[PDB]
Swiss-Prot record, chain B:
Catalyzes the epimerization of dipeptides with L-Glu in the second position. Has epimerase activity with L-Ala-L-Glu, L-Pro-L-Glu, L-Val-L-Glu, L-Thr-L-Glu and L-Met-L-Glu (in vitro). Part of a large, functionally divergent protein family. Protein modeling and substrate docking was used to predict the substrate specificity, prior to biochemical analysis. The keyword Metal-binding applies. Mg(2+) binds at residues 191, 219, 244. Transmembrane segments: none annotated. Its cofactor is Mg(2+). It is an enzyme of class 5 (isomerase). This is L-amino acid-D/L-Glu epimerase. Pfam families: MR_MLE_C (PF13378), MR_MLE_N (PF02746). One of its GO terms (molecular function) is magnesium ion binding. GO terms for biological process: peptide metabolic process.
Length: 364, 362
């Protein structure tokens, strides 16, 4: 019987190699909070979550307070084997702030795996160690956008996630350029980040039909709450429609399933508040015959490893896991081999294998 | 034209006279963040919002960061007259954190009113100065609860909000005790804070009908997201059903209107992110023939004043505004006369009429 006797955090700031721009925001960096749980046997578990305030509403400052002043009193002194009960009772005290919850759920999984002397991926039941990711391309003018895609293709990515929804006229013009520049061995994924209205979405889909493109998904074309439009688009489209911001948790998944509002759900740990809730979504989706992909915020490689581990355990093969491509290799090379576009888990790691304490000063 | 050239924040904590406890939480104090906006003509304006993390997810520390580092760059240097656009631009950078938005929205309205040398209530179109509130009663054992109610009645409240949803057997037994101790001059409002399932809700409603009791509303009996159950309870019930946690913003209001999931919406500024979004809810409800009441978190008298101002401007007469009853009179006596159960705005205040001098400058 191991008990959690300490909880500490540290902020992590990472610079991006190039500017990330979506319909929602623009950034050159990632802000994350790491949490450390210490067992009474000295073993330490870790989780890392992004603060993407425009999407999940999380802030580093809110996460720190929640974890150290709200969750901590519930967790401290509790048995590791009571994790499900502990997380349920702790999470009930906080509405939203899903990324804060992600950090805690991940640290618990790290502990659970380490206590069994296995990786988290293995704990969750993964067989495979490799998942393929697209690379995503910032909003920008057509010329710049074609250049970024060529860079991705030269880097060995054949699945390309094209951000749209910032400028609809630009989005339409871009299709022409794509059709001219790339073959059908390149697979496109469009993600509007809610930036289109219903009419524009249908128009974009009709426009795709005018060219010869390999298009795999249309992701979150409209506002997260316009489930009626999502259903209409899903019925209209010959291309699978993906819900992202429309689905954070299991009850969101129930709603989109009930309303036939997508063909596929993009599961993200920063939205679900960690692995436990993501598992519940996957079960619901499976029962409903809805497929799942995994995705992320522009977030640290640690979140990517955790997400890859989950996907491998759940037989999820469609992934937008690209942040590794936006940051320095040394940030992930302790735990991941990225042979683009393949994210490969390194062998024989205990827990996730993040190796955070070496570079970060944790404080209670 | 006036431009906003400075933004400051301050944390304010206030003690409660007695313990507030619901199905949600238990507390002896209020945590608030206040924001001050300064125009380049010297006029300052203020808004104050609660951090009730279990409900809106807001934290003091989160609100502080959001206002200083996210909202401030958008607001600073902007024209006051552009406020609708400025707030739209600012709020699109932040999901949730509605109480942080409330603080900023209120400070803008304080400025707007002060620029016209009038109260915010007057700015919003209010004429009347007074609104009746219930008093709310903490969860407790039956005997405890009867005593708290008697205290309220003795204090002159005739509308009583009874918190339920923590212990269902207690809730059911309590009805017998109410029917025994009280006549129909006392009107009850039950708020389960989501604590009941569908079966329990129908049972409580049937139980009510076994007695002689004046029952005005049943509030948020089930989970905020179970709209199907809300719609079923609404159809089943002979008592008006109120959506609280099911409606934060206008798009939430559209959903409950579309699904016929309530008879009435409880509008709170801490959920709406301030007055502009609250006005949009009111317009939608009006169009759908859905009534509105106003409500609050357990929050500062400044928030209560802002909410009373909105209600008076919107012809909303049903209110659960009680926190004034939970704090020392000298906190609010400058801008409000609470002669129970009447919340009455003082004459000739400019803007809201509260200031931060003790917090910021002393």
């Amino acid at each position: 019987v191991s008990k959690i006797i300490d909880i500490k955090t540290s902020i992590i700031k990472i610079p991006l190699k190039r500017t990330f721009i979506t319909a929602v925001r623009s950034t050159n960096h990632i802000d994350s909070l790491a949490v450390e749980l210490t067992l009474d046997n000295g073993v330490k578990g870790y989780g890392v979550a992004p603060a993407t305030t425009a999407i999940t509403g999380d802030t580093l400052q809110g996460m720190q307070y929640i974890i150290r002043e709200i969750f901590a009193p519930v967790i401290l002194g509790s048995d590791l084997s009571d994790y499900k009960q502990t997380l349920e009772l702790a999470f009930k005290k906080v509405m939203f702030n899903s990324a804060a919850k992600m950090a805690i759920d991940l640290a618990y999984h790290d502990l659970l795996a380490k206590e069994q002397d296995i990786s988290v991926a293995k704990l969750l039941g993964a067989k495979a160690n490799s998942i393929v990711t697209d690379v995503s391309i910032s909003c920008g003018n057509v010329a710049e956008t074609i250049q970024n895609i060529q860079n991705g293709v030269e880097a060995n990515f054949t699945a390309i996630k094209v951000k749209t929804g910032a400028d609809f006229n630009r989005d339409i013009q871009l299709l022409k350029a794509l059709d001219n520049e790339f073959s059908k061995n390149i697979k496109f994924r469009f993600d509007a980040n809610q930036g289109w209205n219903l009419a524009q979405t249908k128009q974009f889909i009709e426009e795709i039909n005018k060219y010869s493109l390999n298009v795999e998904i249309i992701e979150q074309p409209v506002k997260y709450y316009d489930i009626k439009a999502m259903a209409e688009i899903t019925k209209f489209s010959n291309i699978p429609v993906v819900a992202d911001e429309s689905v954070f948790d299991a009850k969101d998944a129930e709603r989109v399933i009930d309303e036939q509002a997508c063909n596929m759900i993009n599961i993200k740990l920063a939205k679900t508040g960690g692995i436990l809730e993501a598992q519940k979504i996957k079960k619901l989706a499976d029962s409903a015959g809805i497929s799942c992909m995994v995705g992320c915020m522009m977030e640290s490689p640690a979140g990517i490893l955790a997400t890859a581990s989950f996907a491998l355990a759940e037989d999820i093969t469609v992934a937008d896991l690209d942040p590794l491509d936006w940051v320095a290799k040394d940030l992930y090379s302790d735990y991941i081999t990225f042979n683009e576009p393949n994210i490969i888990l390194k062998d024989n790691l205990k827990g996730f294998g993040f190796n955070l304490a070496e570079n970060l000063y944790f404080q209670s």
